[PDB]
Homo-oligomer: 232 residues x 6
């Protein structure tokens, strides 16, 4: 690995991955005896314990290309179970800010990364691990958190998401938009990793405002449910 310079043995088999380095640092305060095992290229990785289990929290940056590199290197250091915890923009009006979306599949446009890894443009089913996803639903229900289960569209161009865009994807059965799930699910299917994803709704493209104190609380509550699942 040339991006994540963590020593083997410093990365856990169970990893909670987030796009924002700031979130990784904030969430590391939920672990027992957290240690920073990497900061190279801004990809902060922390390792500690939770519920009698060793767990790491890693930063993946923005986009498929970035998360693909991070996952490949974490896997080379020992990781094989990944739960992405990010933020997303809702594509339907009934979902409120601060609520959660447990992902069951990812839509995506063919090309680049997918062509290079798959060798052709076939539409491979981009889905998370069945069991791990059901465990997430169980954990979020236990903590009485408001969630929705559905597919999301993994976009590669944040600034090309206009109004035509929103009705198009919502009409295709997607309830939110983000940028890394399709890459995570497909690469995991190919590499044999167990992955899942939970997202915090930070905006609604179909429809409200969220402070930041209510948002930080949302992030924190969801993180605890994710860690519960990872260490089950």
């Amino acid at each position: 690995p040339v991006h994540i310079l963590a020593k083997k043995g410093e990365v856990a088999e169970r990893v909670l991955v987030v796009g924002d380095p700031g979130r990784a640092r904030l969430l590391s305060t939920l672990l027992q005896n957290p240690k920073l095992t990497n900061e190279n290229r801004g990809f902060l990785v922390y390792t500690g314990k939770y519920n009698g289990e060793t767990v790491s929290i890693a930063t993946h940056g923005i986009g498929g290309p970035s998360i693909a590199i991070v996952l490949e290197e974490l896997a080379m250091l020992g990781a094989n179970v990944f739960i992405r915890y990010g933020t997303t923009g809702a594509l339907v009006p009934y979902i409120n800010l601060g609520e959660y979306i447990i992902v069951t599949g990812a839509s995506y446009n063919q090309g680049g990364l997918f062509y290079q890894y798959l060798r052709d443009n076939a539409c491979v089913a981009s889905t998370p691990d069945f069991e791990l996803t059901n465990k997430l639903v169980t954990s979020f229900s236990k903590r009485n958190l408001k969630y929705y289960v559905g597919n999301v569209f993994s976009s590669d161009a944040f600034y090309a998401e206009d109004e035509e865009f929103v009705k198009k994807w919502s009409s295709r059965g997607n309830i939110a938009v983000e940028m890394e799930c399709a890459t995570l699910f497909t690469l995991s299917k190919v590499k044999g990793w167990k992955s899942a994803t939970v997202l915090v709704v930070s905006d609604n493209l179909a429809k409200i405002w969220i402070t930041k104190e209510e948002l930080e609380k949302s992030v924190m509550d969801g993180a605890k449910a994710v860690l519960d699942t990872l260490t089950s």
Copy 2:
């Protein structure tokens, strides 16, 4: 109005078990209370009756995405909105035995044709079944103590273009079996607002040509599984 499924108003139930083979539609109809044949046009047999006191239908969809799309579209026009496909499949991994079941979590497919016509472009839309309904099937099958696996399948359009290279390609991509209608079922359902799921009976194993099963043992498997599916549709 429908031009293939010639049924009248109120004859088609909201919940439907769809199968590809008309022979299987007829055989499974014997599991219902007072089965009535509501359609036979173009060979697409459809039966309507009761199971556990609930009204339900069993419909034939023929082979391939173009065929099942027409049948789903017309059944929906007749009032159907919940579909559980119950078919057969060829396993793509060595550890799955004949007669066992696969509860589908998603479908891989090659772009083009039907999808381009419905989606208007070549984006890879997530082709997945209804989350809740799929979990209900898992519960139902484990209750009847039936051996099943949960995973993705590849929905092929060319039965006779499935060679060895084919098997390693799709199995390496997270698919554990191959059939021909799930991708169309799931995608059209997501776009139309229908609730769908799929359970398949393993009738062959492309990764293990040495194993075989008789129609007696297979028919037995089909029957046991049909009960589990019907329990779910009427839950």
Copy 3:
């Protein structure tokens, strides 16, 4: 060993008239001498008999390219090598009336899974019928004084996505009708070495007849096709 068409080898003729509707296969079998039902599996009815001093079979192919591909492949494994599809179609031009016929000279299609799986890439391989066989059809229909038009058709994969925008698009591309199996039939036949053709009965005009007038049209056309198959 075929898993859809369970007819015993020798029970399928080298010459086959294929139709999508099982009901039509049953009805047309009455045009053969000493007709025998050689297959019923999966609803794919297949009858074999004689006509004009030759053995001939009438087979059901179902709806769509994936369905007809399977049927053609298995009939061929059983000895068939000449296929003439007889179906129904919706005209894309206003001057063609219901009940008239269309002898197909080529098929337009959208790039898709079936063609990619068989061709291995996205090349637009010419999807055309056998030239000689197609001319024989023209001769047979002309002999029976039947009104027909020759031209290309679009083989759609999605019946319920054919809107008005659809009609202008394909008619401006040189197609005079729409159906769902010709492209698959023609392309597979060229790759496999089979001799194939197609005649269609216009049952609807998307740009502009009693069940008794239609039924007569179907029957009259079937006779022309059988004459061709045994010419």
Copy 4:
């Protein structure tokens, strides 16, 4: 006004025999009665004269789809509506001999720029000749006792990329020869409403005397002219 074919309106016939080589256009013009050179701009030689009671033109189209598309479009703007391409080709099957003829029934092609610009998407529109006109060609060649074969051809865009793997791929796809302009001719004609067809002279066999070739080219040209005026 057309910017490549500078012929005056009336100087181009409704019936046109099109060839890729300007040298062939010139040579074949001697088969016409009272031939007149109506254009030479950009090297696209066009002659117009008479044959069997009808006015007929012989036009040069250059090499490749982009070139023939431009020539056909401008000839049409000048009054042409029936086109028969007469070219040379390389057989893809060993049983066809040099100097023999191939009457084209369809053209295979790779999806590409020209087709996308004209069709607006990647659909594989049937690239076929006019059925009636093609049958007339068969009749003319048969009457002159010439040896021909009917079949599909692959319209290649890259002459120098046709390796051995190439021969196997296209021959197994139902094509009996390779050339470069038929797909463009057929598809554009179907969209524009023109009546077109093609006859080819086999100048090489990729699977297996110039005095005999000249004879073959001339004999075929007469059969094509008979067809255009039939």
Copy 5:
């Protein structure tokens, strides 16, 4: 070679390539003791001297498939440096007829020729030789000629270039449209040839209200040819 029938040593290493054979013959008058080395299939090729340097002027016809054949055969005959000198239609209103465009890259729709040569649909960078292109800039500025530097769209369908077409390509950074540059640049990068292109603006699709006469245009072609030949013999 089966199209360009020249013998060993008759084709120069440096070649000025043009689409119109009429232009090839006309420009040959700028050479010392020009000799016609080929006329087969209409592809006129002349070889002579400029500034005491041996060079050739060759015809390539219209379109990617045509220029590919010509370049491949000229290269088989010994050519390795190509400078295309043709005509083009501007896609922006501020460019006047008779002015010049020095090409920095070519946009194109995938398929056909590119798929056959590249074996897939990757968008390979279609650009000219860096050094040669800068030589042309120096030469044109030296002869005080008005020119613009930018990318062009290499179209395959002349009669499918409507107005929507103009806004689409101009919004993508292309200032003109022609039909051979993408093929020239890509094939050169793959084959190892040194190539570049200068185009004379003969029309403006963004401004249909401007025109030029064959007199003023011929003068434009001539002046530009001198600058190109100066570069080819530098």
Copy 6:
């Protein structure tokens, strides 16, 4: 902007963009009175002066999607001139570690990002600003730095770059591989920004360097880039 939380006026019109946050911090020491104007999501942005001009040094992360977001937001805050200074893997054996590559174009695989922005799969010419690129060549020559001018392939999958890969792209006129140039150039053409790129060779995929020799290389090239940006 929701990623780069800097106020308009804190981002310069001239920007030197790098992928590594650490490089941005290191290179900021070359500016006069550097100020950190953003750190959100890890995208460090510094703004200071150099040769009488105001300039910013911004972090863009890894990949097309990431740099596209950063460029769009920097532009919304006033930026219109961008010079990417990154690292790259050489695809040809004659280029040594620590040497530089001035980019003249970028090859790429269609799909995703490009389809969303361009609305189709056309291969738009992904090239830098002609003038700005020539200014870079002049600056590197002046500082007697060893450089090569050529095209690069912008890959989206770092871990799919095998041996077959190297020969393929090298045979297509590309002398190095990186991941952001195609996005930078194409988006710049569409948005009307002036962009260019210089890369430090950190690996050679066709054919070693410590780190001190490398840091020296990065530093020397950064000064040449800043000279170009402020000319």
